[PDB]
Each structure stands twice: as structure tokens, then as C-alpha cells.
Amino acid sequence: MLKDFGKKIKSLRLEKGLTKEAVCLDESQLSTRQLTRIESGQSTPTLNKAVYIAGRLGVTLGYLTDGE
Amino acid sequence: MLYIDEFKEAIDKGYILGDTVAIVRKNGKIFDYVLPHEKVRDDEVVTVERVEEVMVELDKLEHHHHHH
């Protein structure tokens, strides 16, 4: 995933009024610590974590990759 | 869920310095790392482990395991 992904998902999450806990749920795919690191750019998201986040935020993967 | 590339990134970028790091294991297996001032939940099992041994254990996941 490219570095703009973290910027997109942070702003989208905040816009929707969702917590990091609401995105990560049982955390088997992503812990709240891990999501925080992705949103700041500290950590690059794996593809599997990225598609998990997209589903939780209610958008397709292509939307967050801008069709790339 | 934590794989080798994510862990190596944290080392290479300087988020994990030195020879040991806090590790969360869930169901016995490496689940996440924990950095200073990140929050741990009461039912997470946390252990200070040697970075080089975490690397070896995570690299096991990268090897091909054939099955019939």
C-alpha cells in the first residue's frame, strides 16, 4: 500500500465519527495499536489489513487506492 | 497478527531500538509488539523478548509448508 492510504483512512474514520476500536473490533486482523501506527505512517499496512480497514469504513478497496 | 515485514520495518525505521521489545502473544503466538506509552489490555499476555529471536520465529511463517 502507498503512503496516502494512512492519510485517507484516518480522515475517513474521523469524518464518520468512528473510533479505532470500532474499526479493529476483536483485533484478530488489526489491533488498535497497529491502526494508530498505520494512520501516522509509522507502519505500512499489509494488503490484508488494508482491505479489512476498507470494509470497516464502508468503502471499496479501489476507492482507497484510487483505482490503482 | 504480526508478520516479519512489519516487524523489520519497525526496527529499520528506528521505532524498535535495542535488543529486546515487548511482545503480545495471543493463543500462544506472536500477535503484536508494544512500544512505550502504547496501551495494553488486561487480558493481553505481554513478555519482553529478544528482537533477534522474534525475527527468527516470525521468519518461520515465510517458509513453504507442503501438505497433501
Numbering used by the authors:
A (entry chain B), B (entry chain A): 1 to 68
Q: Any passages from the paper?
A:
Within S. pyogenes, Prx functions to inhibit the quorum-sensing receptor-signal pair ComRS, the master regulator of natural competence, or the ability to uptake endogenous DNA. ComR is a quorum-sensing receptor and a transcription factor that belongs to the Rgg subgroup of the RRNPP protein family, many of which regulate virulence in pathogenic Streptococcus species. ComR is a monomer that contains a DNA-binding domain (DBD) packed against a tetratricopeptide repeat (TPR) domain. Specifically, Prx binds directly to the apo-form of ComR preventing DNA binding in vitro and acts as a repressor of the S. pyogenes competence regulon in vivo.
In the case of the proteolysis experiment, full-length ComR was cleaved within the linker region that joins the DBD to the TPR. The crystals grew in similar conditions and both diffracted to 1.65 Å and 1.60 Å, respectively. The obtained complexes are nearly identical except for differences in space group (P212121 and P41212) and their cloning and protease digestion artifacts. Analysis of the DBD:Prx complex interface reveals that Prx directly interacts with the DNA-binding surface of ComR. The interaction is highly electrostatic in nature, with Prx using a large negative surface consisting of conserved acidic residues to complement the conserved positive DNA-interaction face of the ComR DBD. At this interface, Prx makes several hydrogen bond and salt-bridge contacts with key residues in the DBD that are critical for interaction with DNA. If the DBD:Prx complex is aligned to apo-ComR using the DBD, we observed that Prx is unable to interact with the DNA-binding residues of ComR due to a large steric clash as this surface is held tightly against the TPR domain. As such, to bind ComR, Prx must induce a conformational change in apo-ComR to interact with the DBD.
